[PDB]
Amino acid sequence: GAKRPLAVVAPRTMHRYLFLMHMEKVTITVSPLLFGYGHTIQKAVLDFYRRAISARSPFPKDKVFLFYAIDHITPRI
């Protein structure tokens, strides 16, 4: 639904923290059955989570939901 067309130019900065903006929920789905050692996208996503729920995060900690999945899911946010 759009009454007026979209914008043509976007501002550019570096976002150090995830902060609740217009988002009402953030879901993080990982199958622990998918597994490996060292730096992997698994580690990256779970680290996303670790950052969002950390002490210095402006994100409200009640709206972040971690989900363990059974079958072999490429971790998604």
Partner 1 sequence: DEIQRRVADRTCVQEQSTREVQERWKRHVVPRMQTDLEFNLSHFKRQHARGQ
Partner 2 sequence: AAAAAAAAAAAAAAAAAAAAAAAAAAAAAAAAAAAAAAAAAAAAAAAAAAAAAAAA
Partner 3 sequence: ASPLPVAALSRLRITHRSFLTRSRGRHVCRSAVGVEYRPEQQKKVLDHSYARVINAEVVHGDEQKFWGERRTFYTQRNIFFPMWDRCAQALILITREVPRVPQEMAFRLMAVFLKLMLLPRLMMNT
How far is residue 42's CA from residue 38's CA, in Å, rounded to a whole number?
A: 10
20 binds, among partner 1, partner 2, partner 3, none (CB under 5 to 8 A by kind): none
- End-to-end CA separation in angstroms for the chain: 25
Cα–Cα nearest to 52, from 64, 70, 68: 64
Site for partner 3 in 8-27 (CB under 8 A): 25, 27
**Nearer Cβ to partner 3, position 10 or 37?**
37
Q: Does 66 bind partner 2 (CB under 8 A)?
A: no
Q: Does 59 bind partner 3 (CB under 8 A)?
A: no
Length of the chain: 77
Among 4, 13, 35, 56, binds partner 3 (CB under 8 A): 35
